[PDB]
């Protein structure tokens, strides 16, 4: 994706003799980090920490609905929740790798 084949073959004579000399290091373009490969334990720990860092009871029970509920129903409604995450959302992008066991 970042470098499709089709570039002209490198010529030593052109790089040495011709003026101005043409080398792949002459014209350089800044490159953003395309992707990274994280360890599975780091992925799991980061997911757990991020999930527990955004657990707001006030967000799950918006007013004025939460003001007309007894204790048991409120605690029952706060019992369960779920979260979803995406690879490309992180900077830089992450790619999963492992062995199916």
What resolution (Å)? 3.4
12 vs 7, 27, 60, CA distance in Å?
A: 15, 17, 67
95 and 36 in contact (C-beta within 8 Å)?
yes
> Which of 90, 84, 81 is closest to 42 using CA atoms?
90
DSSP the chain: --S-S-PPPP-HHHHHTSSS---TTTS-------EE---HHHHHHHHHHHHHHT--HHHHS-TTGGGG--HHHHHHHTS-------STTSSSEE-------
């Amino acid at each position: 994706l970042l470098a499709p084949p089709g570039s002209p073959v490198r010529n030593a004579h052109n790089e040495i003799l011709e003026e101005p000399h043409h080398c792949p290091l002459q014209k350089y373009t800044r490159l953003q980090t395309p992707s990274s490969f994280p360890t599975l334990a780091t992925l799991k720990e980061e997911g757990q920490r991020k999930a527990w860092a955004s657990f707001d009871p006030k967000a799950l029970l918006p007013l004025p609905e939460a003001s007309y509920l007894p204790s048991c129903q409120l605690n029952r409604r706060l019992a369960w929740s779920w979260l979803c995450l995406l690879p490309s959302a992180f900077c830089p992008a992450q790619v999963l790798l492992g062995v199916l066991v």
